[PDB]
Amino acid sequence: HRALDVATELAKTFRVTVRERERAGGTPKAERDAIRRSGLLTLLISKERGGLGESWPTVYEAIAEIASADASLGHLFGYHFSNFAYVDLFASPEQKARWYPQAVRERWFLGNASSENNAHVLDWRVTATPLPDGSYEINGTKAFCSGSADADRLLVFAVTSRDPNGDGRIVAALIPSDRAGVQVNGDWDSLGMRQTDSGSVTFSGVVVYPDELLGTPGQVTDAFASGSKPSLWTPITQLIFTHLYLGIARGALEEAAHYSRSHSRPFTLAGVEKATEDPYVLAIYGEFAAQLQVAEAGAREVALRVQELWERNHVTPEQRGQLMVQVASAKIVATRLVIELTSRLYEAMGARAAASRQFGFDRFWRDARTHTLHDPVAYKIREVGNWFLNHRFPTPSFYS
Amino acid sequence: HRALDVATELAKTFRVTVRERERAGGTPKAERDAIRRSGLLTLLISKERGGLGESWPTVYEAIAEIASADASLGHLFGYHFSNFAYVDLFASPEQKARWYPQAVRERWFLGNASSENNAHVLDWRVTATPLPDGSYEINGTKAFCSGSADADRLLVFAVTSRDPNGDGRIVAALIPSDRAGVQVNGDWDSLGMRQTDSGSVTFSGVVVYPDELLGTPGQVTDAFASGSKPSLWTPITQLIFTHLYLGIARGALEEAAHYSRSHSRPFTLAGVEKATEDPYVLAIYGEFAAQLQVAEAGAREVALRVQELWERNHVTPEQRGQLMVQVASAKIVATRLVIELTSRLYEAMGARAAASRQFGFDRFWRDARTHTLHDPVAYKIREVGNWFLNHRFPTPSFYS
Amino acid sequence: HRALDVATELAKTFRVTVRERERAGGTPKAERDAIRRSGLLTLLISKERGGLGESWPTVYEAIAEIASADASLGHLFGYHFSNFAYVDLFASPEQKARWYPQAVRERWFLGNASSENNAHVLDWRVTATPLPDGSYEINGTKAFCSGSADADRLLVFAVTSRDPNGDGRIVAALIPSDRAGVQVNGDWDSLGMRQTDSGSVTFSGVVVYPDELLGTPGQVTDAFASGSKPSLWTPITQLIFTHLYLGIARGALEEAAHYSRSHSRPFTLAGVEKATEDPYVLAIYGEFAAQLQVAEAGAREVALRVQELWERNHVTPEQRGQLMVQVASAKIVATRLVIELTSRLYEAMGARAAASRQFGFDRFWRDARTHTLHDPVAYKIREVGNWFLNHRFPTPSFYS
Amino acid sequence: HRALDVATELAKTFRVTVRERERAGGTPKAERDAIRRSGLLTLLISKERGGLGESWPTVYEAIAEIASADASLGHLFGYHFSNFAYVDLFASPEQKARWYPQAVRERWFLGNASSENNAHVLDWRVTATPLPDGSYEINGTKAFCSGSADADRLLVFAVTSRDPNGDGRIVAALIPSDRAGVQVNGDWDSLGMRQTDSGSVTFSGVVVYPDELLGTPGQVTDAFASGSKPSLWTPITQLIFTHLYLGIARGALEEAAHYSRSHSRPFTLAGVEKATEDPYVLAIYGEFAAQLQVAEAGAREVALRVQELWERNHVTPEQRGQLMVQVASAKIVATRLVIELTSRLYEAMGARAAASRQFGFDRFWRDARTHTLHDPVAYKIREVGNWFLNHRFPTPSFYS
């Protein structure tokens, strides 16, 4: 229970200042350093490589706890583990023996530069062009680069160009964020998730060395189409998002209840004597706390299954598909819950919760409303429906 | 027709500047003056007395149109008519003969100072102490004094104190906002409705003269108990709120639709080619536009009944109770609609509608989430249920 | 008010026996004859042809009132007017001169035989093959032939075959239900709407004469595609369906309230003394009564617009398309309302309301759940969404 | 796994005949005997006493499995284990050492006679009169006596009367169903759950011997008041109900999907070619399947906690209350889920799924609509709200 105590104490500290910090936007440098000092970035690194030797259930629990205090920090922390999962699923034994001890000593907080802002999500234009001795040159602009600012390493994705061994192949690389040619642009100014630094990043002539490549170019595509072990990255990452949503939900419900206990007035017109005994106040907390309990218990069970399959040598398409269905289902339920709860709980608090902007309760809705659009829930719902009705497991990709 | 065209033209100009103005909060003086110049503040004053001689259906449609452009200016405009209605329902013929031509010539924009911030609503501590001549001295601070800033007259409520004829009787008056001892405080910094100037007003020995009094002390309480004609004030005012919600909903839907046509990207992962042809985008617009059509059509019929009873010399408890039930029903449907739609419409626009704070679409949710808390919709629901199941009309009050 | 009084009295009498009658299914001959004796089948025929010269709002009110007592009789009554509307929109002047006085004298109650059970709803295989002197011979089986038992005339649709003037044109005709070769099969055995007689009808060498044809073959296709006046048939008919749903909803709500008032027990475990004072019982009635009030008020407005356009010589596509959007909106709201209400109201009554099957309250859900599937509400939603987002009116058909 | 395989095979046979059997109502003797032969009634009896030595998670999964095929048989099965649970928590080791081997050898299927039909659910009037040798005489009529027909023993509750040591104290006993003076009345005729035999049972001078009593008079009240281990009976039983709802939901979803794949027609008006590819069809299955996956996964965690506490020598009120809150939440979520999906899934199948009564899909709604009224979900919601807001665990009782 040590690591979860550490996460709980971090969250408590973040709650003190989240109201003022998220107003300002920009990079939460002090808080990212506190996460560095905690050791929790090393949760999944073996004790023999200097890490904590912990499990995915602990990582997921920590993500939700931090997110309940500060959704931007929960996001950055969660994405770090999505990035680490990808690295761990593709890195060579030589890379792990070098990088993981270095990640411990240098306290790596990972960011990524992957998606783009072209005509649709499938329009990637950041190129990797071959160089002598096996290196590649990266050129182009990425969007939504969460945790790009103050990142020690960047997980970067590119498509091969002018390549003898085949163009259009996906290369992934882990590079220093201060490698020459990398310009983090700092243009993140969002409705919510305001301290995630998910702005854009520009690559001009950026050199990637062979010992920084995560597998061969195109290997990720072969791994996902085959259902090799790396195909677990998507269910892992979508369950990370799910725990952000559950964390936000719990934090909003607890913050509302504290207000209701200390500040709500009884609607004495109706003969109510204390707000905490109002039948409709109680119904609102009951409806949402009940959904939250079930979603949280369900999410713990799926997290255990992530760990079980994480430890296998081989995961069958059926095992991967079943897990993805369970994860997609959890994310759908958590999405609906957090969006409804963060808006409707005002009705259990009263008008003065909104009349004083500085109370800042709208932060929960703004954070959830921003992140839940990451990928459209309507097509997660379609994927689960296509599984149930047509017995088709979703096609492994970066999003399913 | 002409009045509604003027309202439409006002709304158009407000839409240009609302995003910038509402961020700043404070008093929309230029826009209040444009409303003064439009003549619409006199909509319900008879032509005999210099007004437009128009009807409540026209007022309500004008409220919704302006609210759809700028919710604070729709609120200010609507509340002016709630203040006017109270004056019209309690003032003597002699008072109206003087006040109403004055309001036309001087372009009066009314505000109010009524509710307070103590243990529960209508736990009132602002006192009216009788003076030998029949004047009253007012002392205390009012809260939520919408339209208090830049008001030509304030509708004010107090409770008698040191009164041989009975303490605790509610008096009302219409007084100049710069009467000695009136301090309008400018302490309004809210989630939404940011330019309604609903801060506090402090009364330091404010004298109210006998010709400014509206009825006799406790007369409002007796009219409420009687369910007689002055008790129409509440259904009238609750239907004003309803039209703020319908206007916000219509404005949000049309603003989201503009973004969907111009900015949303197709989810090519699912093979869709234009976002405006996505089946799930279309379902969101259809579900909410459909509910809006029915709600608006229903509201027009209730507004018609408001006009009918407004014109009568006498109104029975049964007519008043039936109207209040119809108004409550409209408010319930409009409340649920606007709260769901201003949040869920993000799902038809995509992540970039939230990723870019300056788009500012969240203004609709913030405005509606703030105002819908005015009084709890749960007890409007109880009131309709008590009528339908038990044949009990609501107990008339400032809220029912 | 005379016509509505007659409908109200018919509905009262139907309420007495509906529970026993709908159990058995089959043909409600005594109740159909009661409608014949009432004269209401002639609501839309002019007084100068023997009819009542009434209006569509009267018809719609009578439909909802009768449906609230007996959904099957309300369906039969309403479909009579859909059949009549089709006849009136396509019939020649000499057809109207002979048919309408005859329909009064002989107290005609119309049925139809239109849809079929092939691969999809567009797949029509009942043929019209040319005979000498301009007659046609009809062959094949129709499905869902509402009101076909005890019908004085059937409205019948076929597609031309072996026709030198063109194959696959849609012809419509009004014929005697006992013409040689017409076999009403009596196979309607439904979850709800159990006395609408909507089973199959088999046509074996059935002769149709030129003076029974409603326009030329293919004329309905042209009138709908061009938006000429007969394109009103679909919004007229879809609003008929809407009033079935509103009538069922009102009937179920009122029947539930009676049980709650006289049989529901207080949940004394929570200190409730009377079920009628339970806060959650009151909340259920309030929610649904409020939505019904708004839906009914909105439906009245749309019914008036039907009458207004019914009286026009020409109706533009904007006028027809805006009416169809308003009708579709009303139907969507009424559909959601009646399906939720007829199921959820058990929670306001208690277990014994379901545990005593004889109480029969499930009739409302059975009737509503059956009819609301007539055409899919999801595509009504898409049609409203396509209009609001893309400014595309529904393309006229038998369904839109 | 062996045990779950046996339950799956039973369910598969029950599925073949449930549609025909449940119309008839009455007692499903052949199916009860198949359950007797399966051994599964002994799931919780230790191997030492001739039982299967299985756990509550296995029991709950078997209940859901059987319920998905035949809700009445799942109900009868599940209530057997609620009856067994009461016996296990209150009987002496000496009693269980005789009864449990006898239950194995004689293939006991337990029923109960507990609730009554007086002014409210707390109003109990079936009396137990103490006789001088320590026996009691039971007199009066019980209602809702699930499984009272063909029962090998009945768990019976009464209140002491003519008792010098205190009237009104609750006594429980396990007695033969054919003891002199027991009359099972066969008056069950319900909307759903039609073969649970939950009719009335009348007791005329029925003798209960000392060694048939479960604890001492009032002992159950003392256990509830102290939140001690016997008060686990409620969360155990409420989670049995929860698995009936999850079972019905899964059965209904799977039956609907078979129709959608086999019989639904594409809505060609809108350009659909396959119903199984319709976007709104897929969205219904996706929404409901996703909620079911999360609810089932959360339910498994709670079932493990039931087993954990079942094995404890002592249980604190905090452990009992935490478990009850988790069970209540699962029940709330499952109730809402099954009620919505058993009605809305028609929209995925089409009109002919309701127009052909013999398809019988309404059985799912009828079963779930009937059972979910067992106790009011509104007060389960209040109980979870009171815990979350005010940190008050539910007051232990037969319902909470």
Ligand SMILES: Cc1cc2nc3c(=O)[nH]c(=O)nc-3n(C[C@H](O)[C@H](O)[C@H](O)COP(=O)(O)O)c2cc1C
């Ligand atoms: C945006 C807004 C404007 C309001 N304007 C007025 C007003 O002009 N006059 C008034 O008496 N109360 C006004 N109220 C207050 C309500 O009557 C009520 O006192 C308040 O919403 C209750 O606060 P509570 O739910 O936090 O207890 C306003 C409330 C809001 C939210």
Ligand SMILES: Cc1cc2nc3c(=O)[nH]c(=O)nc-3n(C[C@H](O)[C@H](O)[C@H](O)COP(=O)(O)O)c2cc1C
């Ligand atoms: C708060 C937030 C953070 C995001 N972080 C990342 C990220 O770290 N890496 C990435 O590839 N995409 C990230 N995305 C983007 C999604 O993968 C996707 O590209 C985008 O949300 C689609 O935008 P649209 O719906 O407006 O078309 C993020 C999106 C949001 C809203």
Ligand SMILES: Cc1cc2nc3c(=O)[nH]c(=O)nc-3n(C[C@H](O)[C@H](O)[C@H](O)COP(=O)(O)O)c2cc1C
């Ligand atoms: C299908 C069904 C089965 C029931 N079985 C039992 C039972 O076996 N034992 C029992 O004590 N109560 C049983 N109950 C009853 C509840 O304990 C409770 O008394 C009842 O649902 C209250 O009915 P009301 O809401 O109409 O007041 C059953 C109820 C239903 C609906």
Ligand SMILES: Cc1cc2nc3c(=O)[nH]c(=O)nc-3n(C[C@H](O)[C@H](O)[C@H](O)COP(=O)(O)O)c2cc1C
């Ligand atoms: C209760 C009921 C009555 C119906 N009556 C008629 C009718 O009178 N004339 C007609 O053409 N179709 C009638 N329909 C059928 C619809 O036009 C449509 O063909 C059918 O609901 C589609 O079936 P599906 O959803 O199973 O594919 C009726 C349908 C129902 C459910």
Ligand SMILES: O=S1c2ccccc2-c2ccccc21
């Ligand atoms: O889910 S994101 C994403 C979407 C599409 C392609 C790559 C990535 C990526 C990498 C790291 C974290 C998060 C994400």
Ligand SMILES: O=S1c2ccccc2-c2ccccc21
């Ligand atoms: O609804 S508000 C209110 C609540 C309670 C007492 C008085 C008043 C008042 C007067 C004018 C406008 C608005 C309001």
Ligand SMILES: O=S1c2ccccc2-c2ccccc21
């Ligand atoms: O709406 S039904 C229908 C569907 C499709 C083709 C024709 C018809 C028709 C004719 C009369 C009444 C009802 C209907």
Ligand SMILES: O=S1c2ccccc2-c2ccccc21
């Ligand atoms: O939940 S039921 C119930 C309600 C109230 C008192 C006793 C009982 C009882 C006993 C056995 C099974 C089921 C039930």
